[PDB]
Amino acid sequence: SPGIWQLDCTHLEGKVILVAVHVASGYIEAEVIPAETGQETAYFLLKLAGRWPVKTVHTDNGSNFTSTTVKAACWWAGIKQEDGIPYNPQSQGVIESMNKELKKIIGQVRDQAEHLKTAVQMAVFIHNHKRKGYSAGERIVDIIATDIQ
């Protein structure tokens, strides 16, 4: 549970926002990319896993599941690459809601930056700091520290 992340891909302004969610806390990392390729996905995972103790990644689609580049990054970084099949139906619902919330935040900050990637990082910041009482940022840290002890 402390090591489980879910990948998520959403679209805005003709671009792709690649998101990783720490399932147990709702904490996110995200980046803007021109298109979701194996290489972009692989590079994003490598960044993520150098930053948090990533044990398991549920990939966002079959192409990223299949991709040899993605498997090579998961190999490199010690990540168990898994499918994203929503055996629990509440999963699709949580991600859809997260995408809608993120796009809403992006629209609130959109005039505060020329480039979408700036607005996306502003959105990541607001999302992770939002007290819902703890924030997602507080929850990930507490979950992982408890696991270390």
Ligand X SMILES: C=CCN(Cc1ccccc1C(=O)NCC1CCCCC1)Cc1ccc2c(c1C(=O)O)OC[C@H](CCC(=O)O)O2
Q: Which residues bind to a second copy, rule: CB under 8 A?
A: 29, 43, 46-47, 49-53, 76-77, 112, 117-118, 121-122, 124-125, 127-129, 137-138, 141-142, 144-146, 148-149
In the complex, the smallest distance separating the C-beta of residue 31 from ligand X, rounded to whole angstroms, is 9
Q: Note the residues at the interface with ligand X (CB under 6 A).
A: 37, 39-40, 42-43, 46, 69, 72-73, 76, 112-115, 117-118
Residues whose CB is less than 8 angstroms from the CB of residue 29 and which lie 6 or more positions away in sequence, other chains included = 19, 20, 47, 48, 51, 124
Residues whose CB is less than 8 angstroms from the CB of residue 68 and which lie 6 or more positions away in sequence, other chains included = 38
In the complex, the smallest distance separating the C-beta of residue 95 from a second copy, rounded to whole angstroms, is 19
User: Do 6 and 36 contact (CB within 8 A), yes or no?
Assistant: no
Selection from a second copy, ligand X, none that 124 binds (CB < 5 to 8 A by kind) is a second copy
Selection from a second copy, ligand X, none that 40 binds (CB < 5 to 8 A by kind) is ligand X
CA angle 65, 82, 80 (to 5 degrees): 110
Instruction: Compare residues 93 and 125 and give the one whose CB is closer to a second copy.
Output: 125
Q: Mapping DSSP to helix (H, G, I), strand (E, B) and coil, where does residue 76 land?
A: helix
The pair of three-digit structure tokens given for residue 81, joined into one six-digit string: 């690459």
